Each structure stands twice: as C-alpha cells, then as structure tokens.
Design a protein around this nucleic acid. Structure first.
Lengths: 145, 150
DNA sequence: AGCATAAATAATAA
DNA sequence: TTATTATTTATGCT
C-alpha cells in the first residue's frame, strides 16, 4: 500500500516542522519510548523515504501515533511539548573501546545475571555502557569459552 | 507592534521550510541586488528575532512582498518556483567522500599535531593528499567540532 | 539491525 | 556585510 505512505512521510516532515522540531529531538523522544528503530538518521531516511516498503509500513503507524500524542502535548502550552520530548538530552559522545576497571566490573555483573546474551541484549548492554558493540560481544564470547 | 512581527517571525520560518528553502536562498534571491542586499545572516537573525524592533518593522514588509509573492507565483509549476529564486540553483548534493585509511591517519596525525591550521597550510595538506581542499578544510572543521563530546 | 561522520544549513562573530 | 563556528541532515557502512 504505497502512495498512502509517501503522503504520510510528507505530512510528517511538515507537522514536525510545525511543532518546530528537529529530527534529532524526535529521535530522542522516540528512541526513549519506542526503540532504536527511531533514531535521527531513521527519521531522516523515513522522511526521505529511503527505506524498503516493509520497513516504512512498519514505522508509519508508530510515527503517526506518537506524532499525534506530541501534537496534543503541544496544545496545552508550547512547553508541554518540551515535557513530552526531552527536552535536551545532549551529550552525544563517542563509544569507548578501551576497558576501565569500572567497565569490566559492570560487564561481569551482567555476566552473573546473563552468561549467554542474545545479540539484542548485547546491543542494549553496550549502549548503556557506552562501549563499542564489538568490544562487548567479543568480551562475552571469550568469557564463556 | 510586537506579536504582529513576532508571529510573522515564527510563521515565516516554517513557510520557508515548508517550501524546501534555505535562508541562504531567500536572501540570495530576494537580494535587490542593486541595494538593498539581503544576506543569509539577515534571514537567520530575522527569524530568530535578533534585530531592533525598529528594523524588524522595516524588514517585515519587504518579506511578505516576497514570501506571499512566491508562495503562489512559485507554487503552480515548481520549475518556475525555482526561478522565483533563480541564480542557476538546482544542483545535486556533493557525494559523501570515503577516505582511504592511509589518508585517515595522515589527517589525525597532522591533527593531533596541529588542531586549527591555516587556509595556507590546509591547502598544502590537501594538495599532496590528492583530496580537494574544501573536503579537507571540513575534516578538520568536523573533527575539531566533534572531540568536544568525548 | 543505527553508528560514525561528511555535507549542508543555520547561528554567531568580525 | 562578510567569515566562521555550531547545529542538523544525510549517507556510507554488511
């Protein structure tokens, strides 16, 4: 169901700009309550429609829902938008790779509670540790073996 | 008269956005150009409301006499909207350069060394490096404005 | 199954 | 005004 979608992508960018919003902001609000599928790059790609049809179809409903909720918060006070968004999580910093004792301590705590992580669990762990994903997944791989 | 120009502020930006237009196009096209010129910075400041209300009120008019003038007389055959702007505009985005790792170290080597170089020594680096100056100017620009995070 | 960054644009300085 | 710096997008990556 195609040109349906393209129109949504269209309206979305519009409505977004109308609530005076950056992809980055949405990115943050979204990834919080939804998931990593909702990063700023993702928003850009969606809006530009640089995704596969299977992917758009999936995203659309979840964008629409959220876009509405946001528009509601905007209604009561253009500072309730802010409540709903973030409104300024900001420290986009590079993912560490070199280990620190605090890091290895953390990794081990995770291990006692989860020796055989699924790959999703590995991305989740790495994100919150702010470590390279490969660094984390290999640590776990060896630790078992 | 404040909201009269504070709301034309807010709305002007979004009308310009919702026409896929850069500030730097607005001023660039709407520039007289035999006086008064209109720079991007103007447009920016205007939008963000960084001007004296006294000069705000001055600009506000000539804005509408272009914004409205181009919203209709541009949108009705967009091959013509893009001629409301003119200046042989429509060009395709620059392709995202991918640097050879050989050259990748070359940079941050000379970067760990000299953080904010000069246009003279920059084009020197670029020359011997087989990469075009602007691209190279920006690697530093970027790497400089990125390491604040980490 | 999104990070890292290169380019573009917008803000701010001169 | 111009020149620069900072934010924001877009895109290479299997």
């Amino acid at each position: 169901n195609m040109e349906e979608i393209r129109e949504f992508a269209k309206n979305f960018k519009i409505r977004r700009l109308s609530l005076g919003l950056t992809q980055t902001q949405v990115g943050q609000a979204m990834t919080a309550t939804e998931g990593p599928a909702y990063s700023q790059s993702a928003i850009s790609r969606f809006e530009k429609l640089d995704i596969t049809p299977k992917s758009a179809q999936k995203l659309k409903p979840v964008l629409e829902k959220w876009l509405n909720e946001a528009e509601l918060r905007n209604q009561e006070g253009q500072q309730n938008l802010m409540e709903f968004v973030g409104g300024e999580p900001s420290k986009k910093r590079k993912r560490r790779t070199s280990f620190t004792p605090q890091a290895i301590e953390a990794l081990n705590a995770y291990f006692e509670k989860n020796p055989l992580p699924t790959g999703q669990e590995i991305t989740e762990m790495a994100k919150e540790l702010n470590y390279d994903r490969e660094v984390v997944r290999v640590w776990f791989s060896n630790r078992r073996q």
